Scaffold this active site. Sequence first.
Site, PDB file in Angstrom:
ATOM      1  CB  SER D 690      -1.035  -0.063   1.122  1.00 25.32           C
ATOM      2  OG  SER D 690      -2.131   0.764   0.792  1.00 25.32           O
ATOM      3  CG  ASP D 768      -6.834  -2.645  -4.219  1.00 29.54           C
ATOM      4  OD1 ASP D 768      -7.511  -1.713  -3.736  1.00 29.54           O
ATOM      5  OD2 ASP D 768      -5.730  -3.003  -3.729  1.00 29.54           O
ATOM      6  CG  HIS D 800      -6.049  -2.150  -0.350  1.00 22.18           C
ATOM      7  ND1 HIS D 800      -5.257  -1.671  -1.369  1.00 22.18           N
ATOM      8  CD2 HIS D 800      -5.425  -1.819   0.802  1.00 22.18           C
ATOM      9  CE1 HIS D 800      -4.216  -1.047  -0.854  1.00 22.18           C
ATOM     10  NE2 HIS D 800      -4.296  -1.119   0.462  1.00 22.18           N
TER      11      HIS D 800
END
Lengths: 8, 8, 832, 832
Positions: D690, D768, D800
């Site tokens: 991330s 995602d 995610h």
Amino acid sequence: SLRFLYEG
Amino acid sequence: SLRFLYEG
Amino acid sequence: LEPFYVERYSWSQLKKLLADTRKYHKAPHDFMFVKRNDPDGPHSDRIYYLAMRENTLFYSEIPKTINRAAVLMLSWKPLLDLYSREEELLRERKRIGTVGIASYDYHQGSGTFLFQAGSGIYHVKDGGPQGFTQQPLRPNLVETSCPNIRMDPKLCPADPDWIAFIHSNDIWISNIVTREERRLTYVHNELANMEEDARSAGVATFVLQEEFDRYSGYWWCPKAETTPSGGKILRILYEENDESEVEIIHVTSPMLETRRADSFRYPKTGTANPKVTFKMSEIMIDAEGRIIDVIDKELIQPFEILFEGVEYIARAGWTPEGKYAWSILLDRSQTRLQIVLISPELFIPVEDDVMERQRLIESVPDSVTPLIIYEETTDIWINIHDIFHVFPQSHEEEIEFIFASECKTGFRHLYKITSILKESKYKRSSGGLPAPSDFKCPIKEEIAITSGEWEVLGRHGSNIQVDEVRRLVYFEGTKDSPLEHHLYVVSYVNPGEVTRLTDRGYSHSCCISQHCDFFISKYSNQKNPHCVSLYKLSSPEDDPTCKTKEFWATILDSAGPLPDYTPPEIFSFESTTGFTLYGMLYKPHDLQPGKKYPTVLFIYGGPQVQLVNNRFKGVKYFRLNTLASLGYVVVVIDNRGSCHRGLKFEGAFKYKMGQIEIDDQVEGLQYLASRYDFIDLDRVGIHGWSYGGYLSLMALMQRSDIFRVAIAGAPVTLWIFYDTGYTERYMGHPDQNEQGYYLGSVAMQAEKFPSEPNRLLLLHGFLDENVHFAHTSILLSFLVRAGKPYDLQIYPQERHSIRVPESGEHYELHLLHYLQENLGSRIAALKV
Amino acid sequence: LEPFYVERYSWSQLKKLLADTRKYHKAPHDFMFVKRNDPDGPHSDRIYYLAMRENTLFYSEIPKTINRAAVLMLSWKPLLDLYSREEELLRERKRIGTVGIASYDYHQGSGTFLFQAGSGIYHVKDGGPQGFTQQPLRPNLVETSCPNIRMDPKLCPADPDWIAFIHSNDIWISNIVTREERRLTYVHNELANMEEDARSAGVATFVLQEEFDRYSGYWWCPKAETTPSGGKILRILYEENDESEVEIIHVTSPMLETRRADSFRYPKTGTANPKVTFKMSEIMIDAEGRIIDVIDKELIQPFEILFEGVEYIARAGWTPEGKYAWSILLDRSQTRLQIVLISPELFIPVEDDVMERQRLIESVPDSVTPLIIYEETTDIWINIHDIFHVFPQSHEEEIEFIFASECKTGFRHLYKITSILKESKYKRSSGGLPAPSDFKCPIKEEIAITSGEWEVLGRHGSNIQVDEVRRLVYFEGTKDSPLEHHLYVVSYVNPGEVTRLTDRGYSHSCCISQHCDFFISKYSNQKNPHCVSLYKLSSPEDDPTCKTKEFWATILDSAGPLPDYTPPEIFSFESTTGFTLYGMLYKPHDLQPGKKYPTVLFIYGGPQVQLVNNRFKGVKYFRLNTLASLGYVVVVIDNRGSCHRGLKFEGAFKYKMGQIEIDDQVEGLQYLASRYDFIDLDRVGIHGWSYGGYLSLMALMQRSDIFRVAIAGAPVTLWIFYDTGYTERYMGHPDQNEQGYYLGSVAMQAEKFPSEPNRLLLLHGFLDENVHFAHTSILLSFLVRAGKPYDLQIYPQERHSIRVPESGEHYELHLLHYLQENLGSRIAALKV
């Protein structure tokens, strides 16, 4: 078709 | 929130 | 023996290499012969054609005599003085890489050209009563009130003032003189989104454009019927599609910043195609060329009754004199073709009022009926072509025509047929569904024009030119060789000796004059580039069958053999499968004695396609040679399935795709490896696009032993994801081939892939509308969970094509670097 | 210094290594204390909690005494007797990846539990007037006529017979004894689809869930007002969002076979958020228990008028008495927080009739107004937290409460404020809109309870407990160290001393009994795994200000230091910036001296997260130990912008994300190299997920020289593709930080990437929905066309987060193999 198209 | 979830 | 290792160049270095070999880099087409009709003039004809760096209409003058010591170089006069979604998708469907004017229309009697350059539709006049220009013409914009782009513009043959076009999936007919414009179909609302608005008139569905190479859904009727007062009635026949029931797919939008998807209709295999049907507009006009009224008509009964079992309108048009409209029609499984005349008296006006409809049906005779003038079947498949010639109506009870058919001999040949237009037993009045044979016609004659263990050519702009005076028929074919396409001629009344016109040692693509006294030929061979030369025909006074040929002029001289391009040599072998399978071999440049070389195998070897034949492989397959020069053996093989070698050969993989192909690739690779001690079989790589990438994955899944690395470009990993037009033709409905689908689907057999890394490489166009990216994404999903590795590369601006130059540069660079680092180089064999 | 090279293993070997180090491999939470009131019994309290195989309600008994020689392990009792898209997303947004009961709701007075478990909603009574069960209870399903999943159940605190839930974005109430079910809001239409219908009631929008950890959008009033007839009125405050103006994003569907993409609303940076308001539902219940009627209610004036400048509704609820409903409100730029009291007299009936609606507005007096009881600005940003505690009404004039704030000093501390509820100067009656200050209440006193170079914790279920008899407040803090979260206590009347109640040497997470006579701590250091224990609170007789603890019982005994596991060394260095940055050094196992090893730097160093503190990093960060087990030095650093080090430290990257962070990761990495010469700088890798992967990409793009490989997991390639609530908080509105964005968006500076391959690996979840896959695919678009290479890995079943085990297995394997072949091993340093 199952036929691509590239022309180098 | 740029916060990934992973557990291992 | 000792292994050879290719030079380890860096990424930046390899880019310099590929940049510099590229550093030095399309012929004319769509020819038309128009007679000058000049008693006193030097020239007999004038030819027009499209040439390229734009793409425009040129012309060139054809002299009555030539100086036979010298080569007349025909000089190119330009005729013309100086992207939407609907275009950019069509350009994918038509497989047309280069920008400009793709095609044009022309009317004989007037001289009117008509063509679409950019967003604009234009027209010019030359050749008719109005004369022959000696300078460029200034293109006349057809003006409009239509907001969006206009597609598929066509001149009305009857009145060349009128033209039709598509606009927001509806038909319109602007007039190039009165400037009158009118919408003929009100079927699709341009504003309302696609999800709830799937009807469309005059257009070819995705499947018909993609899989049956048909790019239009409306056909002007060549003749105009007169009126009492003095005007005239024109007609347009069209296909009204209803894609309501067809599947909706999401493909990523090219504007990646939007992060949205375009919804378009994709008849997935085993699902439904659109609800097609025929229809016809009756454009009434007065003596002034003003539109009196437009009546819009429909079939007197549903399309499911009158054309029982028909699932595709493969082709359509009109009989020479406009009396009947015709249509070529496939069943769903594509093993039963028909040819059906459709009288305009079958169509009645659309009516909302229920008891006016009733009245109109009963005014139509029972005797008016679809006349099926030919039916054929097969246990493999119909291959649609453009060949169909209807002669003028000698007797009113009959229709002479020429057609081609693979279905008789097992090879494609020409057949002259007279069909008798019988009054049908079925009578609508009584009220019932016609019996399975009620519309069939009797075949009076069926004289096979050609015959043998070779094929006539109908796909991709090969056609027939018929001489209705001398009663001959010209055609390209594979008679002299499968590796060379040659022009031939023969009588259609007394079939016998075929006469080859084109010269041996080359592969031609001729375009015979409408007057049958000339023919052009784009020819080449493995060594030479593609010259384009004009040739004049001659019947001796004593014998009209014998046509002889004489070179007349050159349209385009060849560049000459490209410097730094050793061409391949075209080999064969006797296959264990009872066939002479042909291949091409690029030996590594500047060979060594006693050193074995790493081998790359390029591949496609699928249906509709021959790679191995006598043509110049320096244009498109340039890099095969660049590869070789760096020190890779390069092999190309045409497995069972390749075209130009009969139906039964092509049919071998039916219900069996991906199961028989590698067998032949390896067969030829082993036949080669015995003779050629320089072929290192321990370091073989494979790579292809589409069906090519399909087999590359198969190659690696099946034959980990033979192939070290496989590079799959936009591959079919799952047959349940492809379309009807293709998969049903070759594999059938997924229920009628439960097991072939599963064996032919690599993503179902993910665990069969090798647990060695640096072996699988996936390439895919991210915006691929045809071979959807899912194919890769789902293969990866099952690979991921089977625990097998892959290397992936995506080309985000691309589809079933590479169009951006920088995307293609990256593909080439990477593939070479990958090949170097995992096959050729010394570091590659160290890794193991 | 000779370089060490790692053992080269195959794919299949590494898979087996990883699967065998995985061979041998979750604590309790949501504690509640309930007294037995059994003077003759042995137990003072019985506690309930959620614990883990599924995750259910358990309980344990707290004895009145303990044998202080022995340790008491507390016996675990089962209380109970044994996904949709909605759930699938809620789980993502909450970072819960543990199947079971997520949370519950308890009513003190009756004993009623209420917990969603799977589709259904259940209740059981235990620990009220009606005894304490000694055996597992059968869950009682709440029946429904609703066809779809019922999210977010909540008990009415005024009446345990009533509950509410959300269903297709509308608020329903269900009576757990009279069975009566009732839809309270008709805002969304379940049959309507996405693009057309985009309103919702009682629900937290995507941004509120992902960026403000607020999941519910409706709040029961804690007390019921009585009707003349014997019945009563129940109230429910709620958020009503309209997402019509929010952008619409297509995220791929998890069903890859469908080849489609789910549409949902993504407030991109700079675009619109949902336009919001408050509403109120008054449920008139009769004396019987039946619903007489429900009245829905809108604010007397529009939201943007009454709550001028407010963009987000961070938190909300009611005051313990129920007289006003409170709400914490941010402006768009999140540099202005306001606590506002909202009286039900501000709400009027929704009325379509305009003569009646005029008459209703006039009936409400001008004197009734929102009351901004607190407001504060900062030049950095407002970190919202779960701290806010209202005291009972001593005087009708005022309201006392404890709130936490960083604005005052630069560190988060507790402030007991006492505001005055003045009649606003504003008069609706007059007609015009309010002046900027017209609803600001004056502060009668703002006492600071804590203050220092350290913070109070207020997020992730850290909070305050408040003894109102002793007039104390228990909170969690960093006063002893940023590396250790400890439980502290302090008087709020006359503040001063701060007694630490936990033991030094570990970091703690603590629940405190609502009675303040007990507390639980989940505690661990770097060396020992997490235990959970229960300490008895107690005061010396002579001063109830003062508090002490005693060990009462173990709840969860630890596993005892994991085998073959080497914890890292926590290190620190006084940086060039003037902040004492921290880190974690994993030395390689069995240090062969005279050598140097490859170094993988792990990274997050974005906001809201401290990677480096005195906690066991052997569960979540198990592999960081494996990497050293193979001979990789592993380093982690908390660069500037991390949390728990004050605000101004966190404010370092404001308008500057990507710029400041690597300079600290390099500085610290060099510091280490000097002291610890076993760090080979020539082969240094970097990796993170991330924001981790974001800085992995920055590392490679900014410092080609330091970092050999960078492995980037779901990176923020481009900032404009990220939501408002985050991006605008840390980087500001794109129009006003044009340059900061360019520099921070690595998708822009693709040109600045390495022209070498085997350096950049990109990992991303295909589905995602947070860091949309388009981040990766657009960087790839530009890397291609800027000439640069990449390696790509996709996980098609992942958002995610990595949730399929098979997907995670592949990732770790790929990562291990990648670092081996392109960094750590001998073949790797040859490849260059």
